Design a protein around this ligand. Structure first.
Ligand SMILES: N[C@@H](CCC(=O)O)C(=O)O
Lengths: 47, 455
């Protein structure tokens, strides 16, 4: 509770920013990979 | 009265498993009538097990859920192995299976009459997992205000298959029921796989803590409510399956996937507006609940000291089970990217049903030794014994079937026995441990912004 005083310190939040930014970049990149797989996939010859 | 409890049980045991099981059930059964018999017997066994767990919950009265039952009757080691397998096999594989189904159903509208290029299934599945896990780690209030909507969609999804099935049945286009119990051989070896597929529709009977204080009149409310709930859910599931069989032939189901969208195509007109989206949302609902349950699991495991206390840890403010999602997400990624729905289901089912049967088998031992615990409800002798014997015997027979898939689960559940050295050891000699763990545990606690609940 009161023992996480070092979390509210400069640099530590920088590590959190970096980790979350890398996670979000990976998520957007893999979603874009899914999108390009779908788009470049064949378009279902019409019946 | 008891209506609210019945509603809770109904909403906790429906799940998305009814949209995954029928394909596998038919695949390893090869006969419509035998498949329906499999559904009925799985429902009966689920009712028996639910009664057994009701008796267990009433006879112990100690919080903890699945942990307490196994720990109390057997000892520390089976409980440790149970948590080990639940963390390493059961939860990640079940989540991966549900997520693969959700991804296939959400990609079906875009691929109307085609094949989804496998890899896109995994990517959309993983994206859904990531968004669900961050939503669970975002807030708990908004993760519950949406749970009611997901449950309502779950109720809506079953009607979309039930009512048109009723219309087809009343009009009597049932030409596949002329010889219900004949077809492909599908020798007895595949019966454990059929059985495994059978339960997963009834996923949610376990967990579901029933403390003997919420009910009005206990020891009659819990058994009656659970019996009616299993009865009506089994009736709904068998009606859903026969509705599926009204339009979808056995061959048209065997050489196909995502049976719901095939049913919609073969029966309804405009379909992508209703069936795929509703079933994808139904599969989305099961995603939210599991994270909270597995996070809760760690809370009781910290008292005995079987897992590091950081796993039952919580955020300072914006209270979410953050540390329990970062240890479960990568495992789910591993299973979904290195597993198949046919194999992951067996991988999870072998361990989960071995341990559930072992837990229920403790009822025979508990009732034979020291029969004085003020048992509120006395489940008869034959129910827990039959459930445990059938589960253990057929799980053991499942080793012969697809051995390369359950072998990993077996060696992991045997890995827990050596893994007890993390709990007993002479001197850890912190040159290669303890001190490194102290840096690691502190680093994770600082990075993830976690403080204990009230300890
Ligand atoms: N409840 C999940 C299974 C995972 C779990 O046991 O929490 C389901 O309906 O498939």
């Amino acid at each position: 509770e009161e023992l996480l005083k070092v979390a509210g310190s400069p640099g530590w939040v920088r590590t959190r920013w970096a980790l979350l930014l890398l996670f979000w970049l990976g998520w957007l990149g893999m979603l874009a990979g899914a999108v390009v797989i779908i788009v470049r996939a064949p378009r279902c010859r019409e019946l | 009265t008891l209506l609210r409890g019945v509603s809770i049980i109904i909403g906790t045991i429906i799940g998305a498993g009814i949209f995954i099981s029928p394909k596998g059930v038919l695949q390893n059964t090869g006969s419509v009538g035998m498949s329906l018999t499999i559904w009925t017997v799985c429902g009966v066994l689920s009712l028996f097990g639910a009664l057994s767990y009701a008796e267990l919950g009433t006879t112990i009265k100690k919080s903890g859920g699945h942990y307490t039952y196994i720990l109390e009757v057997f000892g520390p080691l089976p409980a440790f192995v149970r948590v080990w397998v639940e963390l390493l096999i059961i939860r990640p594989a079940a989540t991966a299976v549900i997520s693969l189904a959700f991804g296939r159903y959400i990609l079906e509208p875009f691929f109307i009459q085609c094949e989804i290029p496998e890899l896109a299934i995994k990517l959309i599945t993983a994206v859904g997992i990531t968004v669900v896990m961050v939503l669970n780690s975002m807030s708990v209030s908004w993760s519950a205000r949406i749970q009611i909507f997901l449950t309502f969609c779950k109720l809506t999804a079953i009607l979309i298959i039930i009512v048109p099935g009723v219309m087809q049945l009343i009009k009597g286009q049932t030409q596949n029921f002329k010889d219900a119990f004949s077809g492909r051989d599908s020798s007895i070896t595949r019966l454990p796989l059929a059985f495994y597929y059978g339960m997963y529709a009834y996923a949610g009977w376990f967990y579901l803590n029933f403390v003997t204080e919420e009910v009005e009149n206990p020891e009659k409310t819990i058994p009656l409510a659970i019996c009616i709930s299993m009865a009506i859910v089994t009736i709904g599931y068998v009606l859903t399956n026969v509705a599926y069989f009204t339009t979808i032939n056995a061959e048209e189901l065997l050489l196909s996937n995502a049976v719901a969208v095939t049913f919609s195509e073969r029966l309804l007109g405009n379909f992508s507006l209703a069936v795929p989206i509703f079933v994808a949302l139904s599969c989305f609902g099961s995603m939210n609940g599991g994270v909270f349950a597995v996070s809760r699991l760690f809370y009781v495991a910290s008292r005995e000291g079987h897992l590091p206390e950081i796993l039952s840890m919580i955020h300072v403010r914006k209270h979410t089970p953050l540390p329990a999602v970062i240890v479960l997400h990568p495992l789910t990624m591993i299973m979904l990217f290195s597993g198949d729905l046919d194999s992951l289901l067996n991988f999870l089912s072998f361990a989960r049903w071995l341990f559930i049967g072992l837990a229920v088998a403790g009822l025979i031992y508990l009732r034979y030794k020291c029969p004085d615990m003020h048992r509120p409800f006395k489940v008869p002798l034959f129910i827990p014994a039959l459930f445990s014997f059938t589960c253990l015997f057929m799980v053991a027979l499942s080793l012969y079937s697809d051995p390369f898939s359950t072998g990993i689960g077996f060696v992991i559940t045997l890995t827990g026995v050596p893994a007890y050295y993390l709990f007993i050891i002479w001197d850890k000699k912190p040159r290669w441990f303890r001190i490194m763990s102290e840096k690691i545990t502190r680093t994770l606690q600082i990075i993830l912004e976690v403080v204990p609940e009230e300890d």
